[PDB]
Design a protein around this ligand. Structure first.
Ligand SMILES: COCc1cc(O)cc2c1O[C@@H](c1ccc(O)cc1)[C@H]1CCC[C@@H]21
Ligand SMILES: COCc1cc(O)cc2c1O[C@@H](c1ccc(O)cc1)[C@H]1CCC[C@@H]21
Lengths: 204, 207
């Protein structure tokens, strides 16, 4: 199972499962087109998430319907870290705050996205950490609105992994749990952005 | 000065700051909505007082104090609700003289879903053996984290609360591994309370 993998194997597995950075092929049409092409990859990525495929098809689908937008958003935020003030939706679709105002109600979400991006930059989020957070989001957003014990052992597994990475990075015990906490609190914001995002979508 | 408190002082200050449990005054969609809102308005007053006793909160500008309370008040009301609904399986203790089960949620249009979410969370708390000391720490984190990205001072209090939480677990006898694992389970649930607050605002803003 996934419960038997070591911290290094979990990370290595997660890294190798990573989806590719897709390209942007009226504003909304590009984002939905890009988002929809991204969705196909997400699914195949989910199946590579240790612990995921051990669930019933119904649960696998419930977990994806629940977190797909948070997942797209954390990926968006991730590739935007080295472009302060901008959101890199795709290598050929990097938009800034002003371009957001273009669509109705999008400036509020952009600012939250940029803010979450600064936070990651300010924190120096590592790629190894990032893939862990993304998996935690997958297994955690639909888990309370549903197996369950399995999901919780896997989440503890990823937590161990996260801590393991910090230990190796050289952080002290106290820094380790302080960072884990900071990283996890950010998921609340991502959850919040996803909710706003859904509202913005449903109104179209 | 709040950044100078020890894990034990932090706990004491938080438990002392705790606001009181209020009482409410078949239900129709109209009266039930009035009972809940009346209770909420009265609770909000004590929350603001409680907010001011949260280490580092008053050190913030008035504009930031208002932003934090404005974005987190429902999450705070709901975590309090979930907390006092632990011992009452399948029910929500909005107040002693107001314990509603899921069926009394259908009374209001589209509230039964918020109800199921709230109840599930209550189960998770019960299931996790959530302790009052841990509970006051989460509530505080909720307050300070809800609008922090929409600052340096705020993150130190948070780190202070993280250490307290761990401290509480260490004393309880959990191994280092169990400490980090429990810390995560607790924090991942704030993600769900956030969602509930969000669906809650939608429902409230809907009428
Ligand atoms: C960004 O504002 C949220 C947002 C608001 C909205 O009304 C519509 C959309 C939004 O994010 C876009 C997105 C595209 C690619 C990504 O990697 C992430 C998100 C797509 C996702 C679904 C429709 C469209
Ligand atoms: C199902 O609750 C969501 C909910 C939906 C809604 O449309 C209206 C309300 C709700 O929660 C109630 C609540 C009252 C006391 C508490 O301790 C916690 C929540 C109050 C809070 C603001 C208006 C009312």
């Amino acid at each position: 199972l996934a419960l038997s993998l070591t911290a290094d194997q979990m990370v290595s597995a997660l890294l190798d499962a990573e989806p590719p950075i897709l390209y942007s092929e009226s504003m909304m049409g590009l984002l939905t087109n890009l988002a929809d092409r991204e969705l196909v990859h997400m699914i195949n990525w989910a199946k590579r998430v240790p612990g995921f495929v051990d669930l019933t098809l119904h649960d696998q689908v419930h977990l994806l319907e629940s977190a797909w937008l948070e997942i797209l958003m954390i990926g968006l935020v991730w590739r935007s870290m080295e472009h302060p003030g901008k959101l890199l939706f795709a290598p050929n679709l990097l938009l800034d705050r002003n371009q957001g105002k273009s669509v109705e109600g999008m400036v509020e979400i952009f600012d939250m996205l940029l803010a979450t991006s600064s936070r990651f930059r300010m924190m120096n989020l590592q790629g190894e950490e990032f893939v862990c957070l993304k998996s935690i989001i997958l297994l955690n957003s639909g888990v309370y609105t549903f197996e369950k014990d399995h999901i919780h052992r896997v989440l503890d597994k990823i937590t161990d992994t996260l801590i393991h990475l910090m230990a190796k990075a050289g952080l002290t015990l106290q820094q380790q749990h302080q960072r884990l906490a900071q990283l996890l609190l950010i998921l609340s914001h991502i959850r919040h952005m996803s909710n706003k995002g859904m509202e913005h979508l449903y109104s179209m």
